[PDB]
């Protein structure tokens, strides 16, 4: 029933990004800047919705204690700029009924109602300690990495892992990006 924001994201900001590790959902933030899970390990080029695009720059986010945050910020060598969604990034997440918007592998155009979310903090994510993790009790799937955790007019984070009973997103913060 409440899909307008997710559909808007899918139409202007959410992509399928292919690396040598496979397909991931990716989120364009502003300009030519997008995010993908760090374990996607993007190379010098990626596929964006199937089209080969050179990676102008990339870097992995870590916190001030050098702990993995599991987000990699990519700058794409493409002319088109993303619709600016920096103003929707929200840390206002405790107890909100959130949605995952997925566009990769066998879950394209996919909207998941993951329920209330909370900050879990530090998690052992596939043997890498990872901070600023947001948790939901929902069954997630191998093909959904990169899914955008959001609510109406709010973007909370990016899905990066799970175990079939609980899923985890890397928190997105406005401070990760050029101020808008």
């Amino acid at each position, epitope marked *: *029933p409440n899909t307008e924001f997710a559909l808007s994201l899918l139409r202007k900001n959410i992509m399928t990004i292919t690396t040598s590790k496979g397909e991931f959902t990716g989120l364009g933030i502003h300009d030519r800047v997008c995010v993908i899970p760090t374990h996607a390990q993007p190379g010098d080029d990626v596929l964006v919705n199937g089209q080969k695009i050179r990676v102008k720059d990339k870097y992995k986010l870590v916190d001030p204690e050098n702990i993995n945050l599991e987000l990699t910020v990519l700058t794409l060598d493409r002319n088109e700029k993303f619709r600016d969604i920096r103003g929707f990034i929200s840390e206002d997440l405790e107890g909100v009924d959130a949605t995952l918007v997925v566009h990769s592998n*066998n879950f394209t*155009n996919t909207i*998941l109602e993951v329920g209330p979310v909370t900050m879990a903090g530090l998690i052992n994510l596939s043997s890498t300690p990872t901070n600023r993790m947001i948790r939901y009790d*929902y*069954a997630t799937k191998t*093909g959904q990495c990169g899914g955008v955790l959001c609510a109406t007019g709010k973007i909370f984070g990016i899905h990066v892992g799970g175990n*079939g009973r609980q899923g985890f997103s890397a928190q997105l913060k406005k401070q990760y990006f050029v101020e808008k």
Partner: antibody
Framework: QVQLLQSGGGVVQPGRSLRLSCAAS????????MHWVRQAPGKGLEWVAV????????YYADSVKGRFTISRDNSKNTLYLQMNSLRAEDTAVYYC???????????????????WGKGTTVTVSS | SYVLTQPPSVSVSPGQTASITCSGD??????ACWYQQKPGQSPVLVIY???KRPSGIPERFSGSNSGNTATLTISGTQAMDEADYYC?????????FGGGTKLTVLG
């Protein structure tokens, strides 16, 4: 309050057409993909067809593709399955069902089915 | 054609745990849901998105999905649970029902 009221069906001669219909009430019909699912006598549930929330995407099981058409009227909260070129193997109870909002693909209409109609018996006299 | 397999029948006495499975290639990478169907009635959703219970569904029903197999467990089976149970898988390209399992509750 949430209701899928089905109508149509009966005995039909092979090669002919029959329209099944469903009137939806108690929810925002235009926001949901809808499926038809059928069950032959003493057999299991079999997916038949899907139409996406706005009617723009339609898919059919191999068993009925090229014969049946699915359609919807989001102003009259109605769903239709037009069964054409009927064959003996189409004999079944036909249910329509709403795709639940807990997790779904809004383009293909794939998902799980959280509300079912009572079912309409179609018997092909062949 | 993607095929989902279920055992034809399960039987338990009241209070026992009943376990009904459905299997298919990489089912654990798709979503599994479960429907209960009593004679002469429409299916009723009892588990969705692998493990979630709709409101009104008794807590004795639980679900899991991993590898190639989804499992519906009834912990403390009741006489009124006698029914056919159908698993259904979905992903973007998939809506498929398993063949069904007849659950008899006896003695």
């Amino acid at each position: 309050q949430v209701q899928l009221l089905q109508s149509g069906g009966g005995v039909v001669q092979p090669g002919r057409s029959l329209r099944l219909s469903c009137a939806a009430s108690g929810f925002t019909f235009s926001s949901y993909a809808m499926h038809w699912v059928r069950q032959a006598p003493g057999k299991g549930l079999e997916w038949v067809a899907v139409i996406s929330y706005d009617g723009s995407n339609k898919y059919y099981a191999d068993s009925v593709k090229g014969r049946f058409t699915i359609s919807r009227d989001n102003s009259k909260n109605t769903l239709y399955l037009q069964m054409n070129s009927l064959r003996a193997e189409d004999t079944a109870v036909y249910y329509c069902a709403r795709v639940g909002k807990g997790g779904y693909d809004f383009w293909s209409g794939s998902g799980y089915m959280d509300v079912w109609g009572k079912g309409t018996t179609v018997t092909v006299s062949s | 054609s993607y095929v989902l397999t279920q055992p034809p029948s399960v039987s338990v006495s009241p209070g026992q745990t009943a376990s009904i499975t459905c299997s298919g290639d990489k089912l654990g990478d798709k979503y599994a849901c479960w429907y209960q169907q009593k004679p002469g009635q429409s299916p009723v959703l009892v588990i969705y998105q692998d493990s979630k219970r709709p409101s009104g569904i008794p807590e004795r029903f639980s679900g899991s999905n991993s590898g190639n197999t989804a499992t519906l467990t009834i912990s403390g089976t009741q006489a009124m649970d006698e029914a056919d149970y159908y698993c259904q898988a979905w992903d973007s390209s998939t809506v498929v029902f398993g063949g069904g399992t007849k659950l008899t509750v006896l003695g």
